[PDB]
Short mmCIF file of all heavy atoms in Angstrom, two decimals:
data_model
loop_
_atom_site.label_atom_id
_atom_site.label_comp_id
_atom_site.label_asym_id
_atom_site.label_seq_id
_atom_site.Cartn_x
_atom_site.Cartn_y
_atom_site.Cartn_z
N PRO A 31 123.41 224.59 105.34
CA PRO A 31 123.51 225.12 104.02
C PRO A 31 124.32 224.17 103.09
O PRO A 31 124.00 224.17 101.88
CB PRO A 31 124.08 226.43 104.21
CG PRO A 31 124.03 226.86 105.50
CD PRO A 31 123.82 225.60 106.38
N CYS A 33 124.08 221.15 102.68
CA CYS A 33 123.28 220.13 102.23
C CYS A 33 122.32 220.45 101.03
O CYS A 33 121.63 219.62 100.46
CB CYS A 33 122.49 219.46 103.27
SG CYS A 33 123.46 218.79 104.67
N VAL A 34 122.34 221.76 100.70
CA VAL A 34 121.38 222.32 99.69
C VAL A 34 122.13 222.84 98.56
O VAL A 34 123.13 223.57 98.70
CB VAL A 34 120.54 223.45 100.30
CG1 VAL A 34 119.52 224.00 99.31
CG2 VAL A 34 119.89 223.02 101.67
N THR A 35 121.70 222.48 97.37
CA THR A 35 122.21 223.05 96.13
C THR A 35 121.15 223.58 95.23
O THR A 35 120.16 222.87 95.00
CB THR A 35 123.08 222.02 95.36
OG1 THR A 35 123.45 222.55 94.13
CG2 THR A 35 122.39 220.72 95.13
N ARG A 36 121.20 224.89 94.86
CA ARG A 36 120.19 225.43 94.09
C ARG A 36 120.62 225.38 92.60
O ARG A 36 121.76 225.57 92.20
CB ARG A 36 120.03 226.93 94.50
CG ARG A 36 119.44 227.12 95.86
CD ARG A 36 119.40 228.58 96.27
NE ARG A 36 120.61 228.86 97.14
CZ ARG A 36 121.11 230.13 97.22
NH1 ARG A 36 120.43 231.12 96.61
NH2 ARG A 36 122.18 230.33 97.94
N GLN A 37 119.60 225.18 91.74
CA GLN A 37 119.98 224.97 90.31
C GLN A 37 119.23 225.96 89.46
O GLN A 37 119.96 226.68 88.59
CB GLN A 37 119.71 223.60 89.88
CG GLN A 37 120.36 222.50 90.72
CD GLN A 37 119.82 221.19 90.59
OE1 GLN A 37 118.54 220.97 90.50
NE2 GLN A 37 120.62 220.18 90.57
N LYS A 38 117.92 226.02 89.42
CA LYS A 38 117.23 226.94 88.50
C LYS A 38 116.18 227.71 89.24
O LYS A 38 115.56 227.19 90.15
CB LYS A 38 116.61 226.08 87.36
CG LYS A 38 115.72 226.81 86.48
CD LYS A 38 115.36 226.08 85.30
CE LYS A 38 113.87 226.35 84.96
NZ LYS A 38 113.48 225.81 83.57
N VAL A 39 116.09 228.98 88.92
CA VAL A 39 114.92 229.82 89.43
C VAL A 39 113.65 229.38 88.76
O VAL A 39 113.50 229.17 87.58
CB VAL A 39 115.15 231.36 89.08
CG1 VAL A 39 114.02 232.16 89.58
CG2 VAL A 39 116.50 231.76 89.88
N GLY A 46 112.83 237.37 97.74
CA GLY A 46 113.74 236.37 97.38
C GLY A 46 113.20 235.55 96.23
O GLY A 46 111.92 235.57 95.90
N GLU A 47 113.98 234.68 95.66
CA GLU A 47 113.66 233.84 94.56
C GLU A 47 113.24 232.47 95.13
O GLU A 47 113.70 232.00 96.16
CB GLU A 47 114.74 233.71 93.58
CG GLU A 47 114.93 234.90 92.58
CD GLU A 47 115.62 236.07 93.26
OE1 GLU A 47 116.53 235.72 94.09
OE2 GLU A 47 115.36 237.28 92.95
N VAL A 48 112.40 231.82 94.35
CA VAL A 48 112.14 230.32 94.54
C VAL A 48 113.00 229.57 93.52
O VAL A 48 113.10 229.97 92.33
CB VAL A 48 110.64 230.02 94.42
CG1 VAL A 48 110.41 228.54 94.83
CG2 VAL A 48 109.87 230.95 95.28
N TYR A 49 113.63 228.47 94.01
CA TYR A 49 114.45 227.60 93.14
C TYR A 49 114.03 226.22 93.17
O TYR A 49 113.43 225.80 94.13
CB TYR A 49 115.98 227.70 93.58
CG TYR A 49 116.63 229.05 93.71
CD1 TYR A 49 116.33 229.90 94.76
CD2 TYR A 49 117.57 229.45 92.77
CE1 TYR A 49 116.95 231.09 94.86
CE2 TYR A 49 118.16 230.62 92.93
CZ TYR A 49 117.89 231.47 93.90
OH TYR A 49 118.52 232.68 93.99
N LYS A 50 114.55 225.49 92.21
CA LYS A 50 114.49 224.02 92.05
C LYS A 50 115.83 223.54 92.39
O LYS A 50 116.87 224.05 91.82
CB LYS A 50 114.09 223.72 90.60
CG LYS A 50 113.70 222.22 90.36
CD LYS A 50 114.72 221.36 89.75
CE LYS A 50 114.99 220.07 90.49
NZ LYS A 50 116.24 219.40 90.01
N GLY A 51 115.96 222.54 93.29
CA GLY A 51 117.37 222.18 93.77
C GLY A 51 117.41 220.74 94.27
O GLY A 51 116.44 220.00 94.13
N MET A 52 118.52 220.43 94.85
CA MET A 52 118.72 219.06 95.49
C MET A 52 119.09 219.18 96.96
O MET A 52 119.80 220.13 97.35
CB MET A 52 119.90 218.39 94.72
CG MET A 52 119.64 218.06 93.23
SD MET A 52 118.14 217.20 92.88
CE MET A 52 118.78 215.43 92.94
N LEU A 53 118.71 218.16 97.68
CA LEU A 53 118.95 218.16 99.19
C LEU A 53 119.63 216.82 99.51
O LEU A 53 119.21 215.73 99.04
CB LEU A 53 117.60 218.28 99.95
CG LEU A 53 117.67 218.07 101.43
CD1 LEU A 53 118.46 219.09 102.13
CD2 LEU A 53 116.18 218.05 102.00
N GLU A 57 120.54 211.94 96.61
CA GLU A 57 120.16 213.38 96.39
C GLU A 57 118.62 213.42 96.18
O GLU A 57 118.17 212.70 95.33
CB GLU A 57 120.94 214.00 95.36
CG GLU A 57 122.23 214.79 95.84
CD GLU A 57 122.70 215.82 94.91
OE1 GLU A 57 122.71 215.59 93.67
OE2 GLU A 57 123.10 216.91 95.37
N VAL A 60 114.06 219.21 95.48
CA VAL A 60 113.40 220.09 96.43
C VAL A 60 113.06 221.34 95.81
O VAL A 60 113.67 221.78 94.81
CB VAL A 60 114.23 220.25 97.76
CG1 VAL A 60 114.25 219.11 98.63
CG2 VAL A 60 115.67 220.79 97.41
N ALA A 61 112.05 222.04 96.35
CA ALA A 61 111.79 223.42 96.00
C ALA A 61 112.28 224.26 97.14
O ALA A 61 112.17 223.86 98.30
CB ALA A 61 110.22 223.68 95.80
N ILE A 62 112.83 225.48 96.85
CA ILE A 62 113.56 226.29 97.82
C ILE A 62 113.08 227.72 97.70
O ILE A 62 113.33 228.37 96.70
CB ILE A 62 115.08 226.17 97.70
CG1 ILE A 62 115.59 224.78 97.74
CG2 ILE A 62 115.71 227.04 98.71
CD1 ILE A 62 116.73 224.49 96.90
N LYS A 63 112.51 228.25 98.68
CA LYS A 63 112.13 229.71 98.80
C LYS A 63 113.06 230.41 99.75
O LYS A 63 113.25 230.00 100.95
CB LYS A 63 110.69 229.82 99.29
CG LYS A 63 110.09 231.26 99.24
CD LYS A 63 108.56 231.25 99.30
CE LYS A 63 108.13 231.44 100.66
NZ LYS A 63 106.61 231.64 100.68
N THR A 64 113.68 231.41 99.22
CA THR A 64 114.78 232.16 99.99
C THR A 64 114.28 233.56 100.51
O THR A 64 113.33 234.10 99.92
CB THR A 64 116.02 232.41 99.11
OG1 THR A 64 115.68 233.30 98.08
CG2 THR A 64 116.56 231.13 98.53
N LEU A 65 114.94 234.03 101.55
CA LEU A 65 114.73 235.32 102.07
C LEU A 65 116.12 236.07 102.00
O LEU A 65 116.96 235.72 102.81
CB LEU A 65 114.18 235.38 103.48
CG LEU A 65 113.62 236.70 103.91
CD1 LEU A 65 112.31 237.08 103.11
CD2 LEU A 65 113.26 236.69 105.41
N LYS A 66 116.23 236.96 100.97
CA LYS A 66 117.59 237.63 100.71
C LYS A 66 117.88 238.75 101.66
O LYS A 66 116.99 239.04 102.50
CB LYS A 66 117.56 238.12 99.21
CG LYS A 66 117.28 237.07 98.21
CD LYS A 66 118.49 236.70 97.42
CE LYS A 66 118.26 235.51 96.49
NZ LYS A 66 118.42 234.20 97.19
N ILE A 99 116.38 226.68 106.73
CA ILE A 99 117.65 227.34 107.08
C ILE A 99 117.32 228.60 107.76
O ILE A 99 116.94 229.60 107.12
CB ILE A 99 118.56 227.46 105.90
CG1 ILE A 99 119.03 226.16 105.29
CG2 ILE A 99 119.89 228.38 106.33
CD1 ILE A 99 119.93 226.16 104.13
N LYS A 103 122.47 232.99 106.30
CA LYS A 103 121.90 233.88 105.29
C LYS A 103 122.40 233.38 103.92
O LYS A 103 123.56 233.22 103.69
CB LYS A 103 122.32 235.25 105.61
CG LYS A 103 121.93 235.78 106.97
CD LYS A 103 120.41 235.70 107.29
CE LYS A 103 120.11 236.08 108.65
NZ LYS A 103 120.45 237.58 108.91
N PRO A 104 121.49 233.32 102.94
CA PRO A 104 120.06 233.65 103.08
C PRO A 104 119.18 232.58 103.74
O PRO A 104 119.52 231.36 103.58
CB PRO A 104 119.65 233.79 101.58
CG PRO A 104 120.49 232.82 100.89
CD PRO A 104 121.80 232.79 101.65
N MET A 105 118.14 232.96 104.36
CA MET A 105 117.30 231.89 104.98
C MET A 105 116.52 231.21 103.95
O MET A 105 116.20 231.77 102.80
CB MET A 105 116.31 232.61 105.99
CG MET A 105 117.10 233.40 107.06
SD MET A 105 116.19 233.58 108.62
CE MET A 105 115.04 234.95 108.22
N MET A 106 116.07 230.01 104.29
CA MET A 106 115.42 229.19 103.26
C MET A 106 114.27 228.33 103.77
O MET A 106 114.40 227.83 104.97
CB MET A 106 116.47 228.25 102.58
CG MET A 106 117.64 228.85 101.87
SD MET A 106 118.52 227.60 100.92
CE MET A 106 119.99 228.61 100.45
N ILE A 108 112.38 224.81 102.60
CA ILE A 108 112.67 223.70 101.68
C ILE A 108 111.65 222.70 101.83
O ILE A 108 111.33 222.05 102.86
CB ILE A 108 114.04 223.07 102.01
CG1 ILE A 108 115.20 224.21 102.02
CG2 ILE A 108 114.45 222.00 100.98
CD1 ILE A 108 116.45 223.68 102.52
#
Side-chain angles (χ1 to χ4, degrees):
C33 301
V34 182
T35 171
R36 293 172 267 159
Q37 307 161 320
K38 170 169 143 169
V39 174
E47 283 80 32
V48 187
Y49 306 73
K50 194 256 130 195
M52 299 301 271
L53 172 65
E57 265 203 320
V60 286
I62 306 148
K63 189 161 93 172
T64 65
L65 196 66
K66 304 252 171 279
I99 296 180
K103 304 301 176 64
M105 301 208 280
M106 300 188 190
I108 306 171

